[PDB]
A and B are shown apart, each in its own frame.
Chain A
Amino acid sequence: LVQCILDNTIHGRIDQVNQLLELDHQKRGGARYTALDKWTNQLNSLNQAVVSKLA
């Protein structure tokens, strides 16, 4: 199981305490809020730098 996860064939981790294999179901359907946040922060820092340089 460890080898399979490290090969990116398994989307999940292992609970060795309880002898359990928890797999990430990745049902959130996101990965777009991350792009929105990156865009927001990058362009707002961009605007702040532009305003500071122009002032």
Chain B
Amino acid sequence: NYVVENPSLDLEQYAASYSGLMRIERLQFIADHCPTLRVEALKMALSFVQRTFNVDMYEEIHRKLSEATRELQNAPDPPALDTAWVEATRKKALLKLEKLDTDLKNYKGNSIKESIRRGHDDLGDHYLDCGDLSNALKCYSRARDYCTSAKHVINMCLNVIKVSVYLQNWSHVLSYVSKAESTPEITQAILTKLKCAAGLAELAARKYKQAAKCLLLASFDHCDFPELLSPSNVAIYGGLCALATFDRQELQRNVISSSSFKLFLELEPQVRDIIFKFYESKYASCLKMLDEMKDNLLLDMYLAPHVRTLYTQIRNRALIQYFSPYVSADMHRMAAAFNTTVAALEDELTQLILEGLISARVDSHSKILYARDVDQRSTTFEKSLLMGKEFQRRAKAMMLRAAVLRNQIHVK
């Protein structure tokens, strides 16, 4: 599946770009899927997990770091968790939480909807920091009841979106994105954050056409959005999905018209060249950059399974567009339009013809790919004769059915 070996990831920037439990999840997966770098990834993870009083995931991360350090003590032939933290962390976490709980329950005796909603949101924020997902949800699911204003609804939607990403309840994210968008009359760019959340949720839900459409509408004025996804990965997420789903004219319009993805492409010049090479029919350089983008972004959270499908689609689409303006396309030249071998391209081309959407015939004698332009009339006549034969057969079947029903013929 994944967990492959490959160097050259910059741990410092990827950890600092994100922040929150999202960063915690990013550091864990990067450590778990990138060996020969798991130690520093785990060392940086635990150094940040101990902040904001985590309880359960800390034990898992500390155990993994202890195993990783033990492994380092045998190859070139385990850290202490300082359980004083447990005594310290629990005692502080309880006292402040109990103090906050006492206030809110007293506020529940005061009966103020906004105060109850705000207090419940604060309780949910504390529970998320404590490492209590469902506990935060119930606090957030009690703040949803006591809403008063449109901004309160927007904040309610954002909190549920944030939590359901960690819970991987992407259905709750999409439902709250729709509620937050369609309701309040479709400088403060609030819809941009909602579109970014929807695109990330759709991409994690194995969707590419709508996710790219949502990501392309994301304005760069949002800038800091580290609770869900960094702008650097957002540009990459949009570019890969657009390359796999959007066709040439579809790509050119959407990227240019958005004028925020141009800024996104400036952030990631590699995908910008990939799209530009895709437009200019330089798929040889386009795909070699793609493979370079493969290893750097296959250790991504919601990308690793989907990127392989996305990259497979990109390879298919690139081949389809390349052959389209060709009558006698030499398979040598088409093979030379990439680092692939003649045999490998022939197998890839044969697979594409079997699946379709290339409409070609392979002439293995001279290794030239000839496009197929069948006469419409001949196929029409053939399938019309087949339809007439099938109609006669079905008429015979119906006449036999009528004969056996009229004569009352049935097994007793």
Contacts and interface: CB of A to CB of B under 8 A. Distances in A.
Interface in A1-52: 1-3, 5-8, 10, 12-18, 20, 22, 30, 33-34, 36-37, 40-41, 44, 47-48, 51-52
Interface string B327-342: 1111001000000000
Contact of A48 (B326, B328, B394): B394
B281 A51 contact: no
A30 B384 contact: no
B387 interface: yes
B329 A16 contact: yes
Contacts of B326: 13-16
Contact of A18 (B328, B377, B387, B401): B328
A3 B280 contact: yes
Contacts of B380: 33-34, 36-37, 40
Given A6-B248, A40-B384, A41-B383, A55 B325 contact: no
A6 B394 contact: no
B362 to A, nearest CB: 15
B277 to A, nearest CB: 13
A6 B323 CA distance: 11
Tell me the interface secondary structure of chain B in the complex.
helix
Nearest to B391: A44
B321 interface: yes
Contacts of B394: 48, 51-52
B327 A15 contact: yes
Contact of A41 (B325, B333, B368, B387): B387
Nearest to A8: B249
A45 B390 CA distance: 10
A8 B196 CA distance: 33
Nearest to B330: A17
B398 interface: yes
B324 interface: yes
Nearest to B405: A55
Question: For the side of the interface on A, what is the size category?
Answer: 20 to 34
A48 B390 contact: yes
B281 A55 contact: no
Contacts of B377: 30, 33
B371 interface: yes
B376 interface: yes
Contacts of A18: 328
Interface string B373-410: 00011011001100100110010001001000000000
A22 B324 CA distance: 13
B216 to A, nearest CB: 21
Contact of A16 (B248, B330, B376, B387): B330
A13 to B, nearest CB: 4
Contacts of A6: 248, 281, 321, 324-325
B383 A37 contact: yes
A37 B330 contact: no
Contacts of A2: 281, 325
A40 to B, nearest CB: 6
Nearest to A6: B248
Given A6-B281, A30-B377, A48-B391, A37 B384 contact: yes
A33 B249 CA distance: 29
A6 B376 CA distance: 24
A8 B281 CA distance: 15
A8 B387 CA distance: 35
Contacts of A36: 380
B281 A3 contact: yes
Given A3-B281, A13-B371, A44-B387, A51 B327 contact: no
Q: For the complex of A and B, list the 7 residue pairs with the smallest distance between their C-beta atoms, beginning with the closest.
A: A5-B325, A37-B380, A13-B327, A15-B328, A2-B281, A17-B330, A13-B325
16 contacts: A2-B281, A3-B281, A8-B249, A13-B324, A13-B326, A13-B371, A14-B326, A15-B328, A16-B326, A17-B328, A30-B376, A34-B380, A37-B383, A40-B384, A48-B390, A48-B391
Interface of A: 1-3, 5-8, 10, 12-18, 20, 22, 30, 33-34, 36-37, 40-41, 44, 47-48, 51-52, 55
